[PDB]
């Protein structure tokens, strides 16, 4: 006979002990552990609500991979690469480049907790978290690898995080802040609670819905299987939050949540936003970017935050306004500066698409439509020089994404600047400036790519020299219009 898990589970996490040959603070130094002075004994009440154990972990994970790989193998000849809309292929290139090696970096966030968290249950669940992120990094390198021989842009599934390309710097600045650059309790709150129960649902399930509409079941099945692991190890954050609240650290927990949600928002606005509202073919858009945000971030995540005892962030109304506006400008910029991307952005402004945009975002044509009108006429007149930039955008010193606003009939743009320690910084929002002010030593001597441009680090100091600095190794790798401007004929 076998004994059920409930009868021996407590012994698997009965692993705290009182150190004698080193001090408790030597064994769990605050800079790596983040216990905020809460003593060892208090962390023993940590109780992970989504449990697993070694025998069932390897058994069930064997089954998950068997399915993910079997589906890929059975659909190799479905002609997805040959027959998909080019904007869908660009969505794949963008996803795998922005995600795969960051998943592998998440191993280190989990490893930080497995060694340095004072909660024994956290240390064990983070060991399975280490394994999960290894899976996700290896899956999302293995799957795009077959397309290397079709298209050099898929090399960026591996290469992006090794480059200084502007979007990879934005990704690395976020993930090094929330995953690999802070103590274990910050990781629990910023990564597993805020990022992994909040925003990853947009890219791994919202995008899966669009993928299923587009007929790409290898990809939809892959990323939804990945999110079943996420749903388990992300539950490390809640009990950490509760423990901090119980031990008088509510203010500190709230601040880490507020910061991590905003940082994740700006990155997902530039990656996921253009994908759901412009790259994804119109007929495959299950919901708009904003409708998905209201399902996953407002309706699901923010409600879960309230239920655990935290408050709406201080920037609530600013966030809602950002959802209506930011990604439309991020999309325009990624498109106009497409040669600096490793994927081919789709303009997404055919007449029927502009009707849908106007329905989903009333006023769109009188704002971003005004810019697209000028672009469209230049394409029609064969003034392609006017559709490619000869300077660089100004870049936020926090998100590493350019400073944008609302164009057209009611133009409004605001930069939030800051003098600090003899340096002038510029931020894309009042929340981004507040994030810097929460922990300036994390950020103060970082130079964004335009800071490096102006300091002589990018030679030649031209757009072409910046492209070389960003790591492009051939003409084919730089982004072009996804449809070679065929949308302009319509």
């Amino acid at each position: 006979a076998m004994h059920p898990r409930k009868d021996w589970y407590e012994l698997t996490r009965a692993t705290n002990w009182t150190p004698s040959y080193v001090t408790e603070e030597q064994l769990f130094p605050e800079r790596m552990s983040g216990h905020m002075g809460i003593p060892l004994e208090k962390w023993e009440s940590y109780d992970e609500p989504y449990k697993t154990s070694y025998p069932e972990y390897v058994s069930i994970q064997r089954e998950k991979d068997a399915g993910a790989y079997s589906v890929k193998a059975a659909l190799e000849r479905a002609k997805i690469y040959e027959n998909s809309d080019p904007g869908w292929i660009s969505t794949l290139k963008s996803h795998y480049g922005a995600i795969a090696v960051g998943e592998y970096a998440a191993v280190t966030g989990e490893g930080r907790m497995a060694r340095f968290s004072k909660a024994p249950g956290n240390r064990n669940m983070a060991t399975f978290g280490m394994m999960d992120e290894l899976r996700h990094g290896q899956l999302q390198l293995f799957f795009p690898h077959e397309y290397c021989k079709k298209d050099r842009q898929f090399d960026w599934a591996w290469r992006a995080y090794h480059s200084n390309e502007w979007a990879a710097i934005a990704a690395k600045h976020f993930f090094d802040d929330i995953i690999t650059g802070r103590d274990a309790i910050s990781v629990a709150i910023m990564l597993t609670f805020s990022f992994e129960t909040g925003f990853t649902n947009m890219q791994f399930l919202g995008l899966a819905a669009d993928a299923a509409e587009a007929g790409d079941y290898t990809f939809a099945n892959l990323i939804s299987s990945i999110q079943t692991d996420e749903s388990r190890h992300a539950q490390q954050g809640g009990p950490a939050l509760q423990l901090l609240i119980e031990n008088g650290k509510r203010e500190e927990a709230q601040k880490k949540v507020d910061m991590a949600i905003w940082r994740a928002w700006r990155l997902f606005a530039v990656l996921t936003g253009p994908v759901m509202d412009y790259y994804t073919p119109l007929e495959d858009r299950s919901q708009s970017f904003k409708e998905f945000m209201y399902e996953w971030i407002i309706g699901q995540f923010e409600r879960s935050l309230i239920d655990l005892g935290l408050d709406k962030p201080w920037y609530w109304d600013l966030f809602l306004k950002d959802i209506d506006e930011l990604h439309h400008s991020y999309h325009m910029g990624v498109w106009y500066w497409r040669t600096t991307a490793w994927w081919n952005p789709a303009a997404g402004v055919t007449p029927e698409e502009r009707d849908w945009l106007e329905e989903k975002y009333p006023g769109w044509n009188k704002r971003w439509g005004r810019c697209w009108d000028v672009i469209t006429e230049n394409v029609l007149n064969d003034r392609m020089d006017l559709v490619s930039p000869e300077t660089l955008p100004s870049v936020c010193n926090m998100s590493q994404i350019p400073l944008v606003g609302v164009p057209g009939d009611d133009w409004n743009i605001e930069v939030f600047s800051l003098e600090h320690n003899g340096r002038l910084y510029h931020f894309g929002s009042e929340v981004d400036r507040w994030v810097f002010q929460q922990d300036p030593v994390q950020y103060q001597n970082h130079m964004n790519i335009v800071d490096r441009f102006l300091a002589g680090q990018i030679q030649p100091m031209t757009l072409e020299g910046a492209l070389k600095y960003m790591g492009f190794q051939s003409i084919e790798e730089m982004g072009k219009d996804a449809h070679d401007f065929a949308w302009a004929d319509k």
Partner: protein, 305 residues
């Protein structure tokens, strides 16, 4: 810029003389944090974690021009690790099931439950220390192929911990008056036979240089556990008609031999730099006395009547 054809694999692998394997594709050259010596992480160069990595990884006296070239001799990836370990662990769980059906624990020699309570069930603390320590080498190692071996080794350490938890609870069902599942923390903290091991591990867990962490954990501590804990426990079980524990430990020893395999492969890589022999030797000689004292105290406790 020039025009170039697509490559059959990743750009960093396209110079290989053979077709890249599944292991090559998903494992090699994934730490971007080693690209920029002044800013491992994409933050302020003097951020706390940038200072940590510049001191404890970049400035380690254990140096190599190409750590990334290291290869797991077993070439394990996540998928094949779980295939191998689901086979081994379903075997161990099948052993648990059948030996329980047979009431194996009833038939051990009189008093063996007291030896297990003192010498076996507190091993969950030692194995958890190995788990914590392996996770530290994972996060600090300067190559993803090194770190991947440490990830799997962290999981194996939890596998051993879980075996011990399961068997500690199971033994207590037949022997409920021996402190099984109740006194292990006190024994780990206070019993003389565990104090050498616990001092060793508290000190090893505060060795933050990645190279010293690797050498002390995998070249000193873990081989001592094979020679001085695992195999003597097997001999004592033999003498006390415990026929389950020797089979369980044989399964665990297959993990431990795999850890020794990749460790020695890394040493062989490291020794390409002639400076590294003296570094590794100094660390081994630094940690061996603590390891030897740990073993001798444990063995005196195990051979106690």
């Amino acid at each position: 810029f020039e025009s170039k054809k697509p490559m059959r694999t990743w750009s960093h692998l396209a110079e290989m003389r053979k077709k890249p394997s599944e292991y090559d594709i998903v494992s090699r050259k994934l730490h971007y944090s080693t690209n920029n010596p002044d800013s491992p992480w994409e933050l302020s160069p003097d951020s706390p974690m940038n200072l940590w990595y510049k001191q404890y990884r970049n400035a380690s006296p254990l140096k190599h021009d190409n750590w990334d070239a290291f290869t797991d001799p077993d070439q394990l990836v996540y998928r094949t690790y779980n295939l191998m370990q689901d086979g081994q662990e379903s075997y161990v769980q099948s052993l648990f099931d059948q030996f329980n059906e047979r009431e194996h624990d009833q038939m051990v020699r009189e008093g063996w439950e007291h030896t297990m309570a003192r010498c076996y069930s507190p091993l969950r603390y030692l194995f958890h220390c190995l788990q914590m320590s392996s996770a530290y080498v994972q996060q600090m190692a300067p190559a993803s192929t090194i770190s991947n071996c440490c990830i799997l080794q962290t999981a194996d350490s939890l596998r051993w911990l879980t075996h011990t938890a399961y068997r500690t609870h199971e033994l207590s069902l037949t022997y409920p008056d021996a402190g099984l599942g109740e006194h292990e923390r006190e024994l780990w903290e206070k019993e003389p036979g565990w104090q050498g091991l616990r001092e060793l591990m508290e000190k090893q867990l505060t060795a933050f240089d990645w190279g010293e962490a690797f050498v002390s954990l995998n070249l000193v501590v873990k081989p001592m556990i094979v020679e001085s804990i695992f195999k003597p426990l097997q001999q004592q079980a033999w003498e006390n008609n415990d026929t389950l524990l020797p089979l369980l430990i044989d399964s665990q020893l297959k993990d431990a031999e795999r850890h020794s395999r990749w460790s020695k492969a890394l040493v062989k890589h490291a020794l390409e730099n002639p400076d590294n022999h003296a570094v590794i030797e100094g660390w081994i000689e630094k940690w061996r006395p603590l390891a030897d004292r740990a073993a001798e105290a444990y063995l005196s406790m195990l051979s106690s009547d």
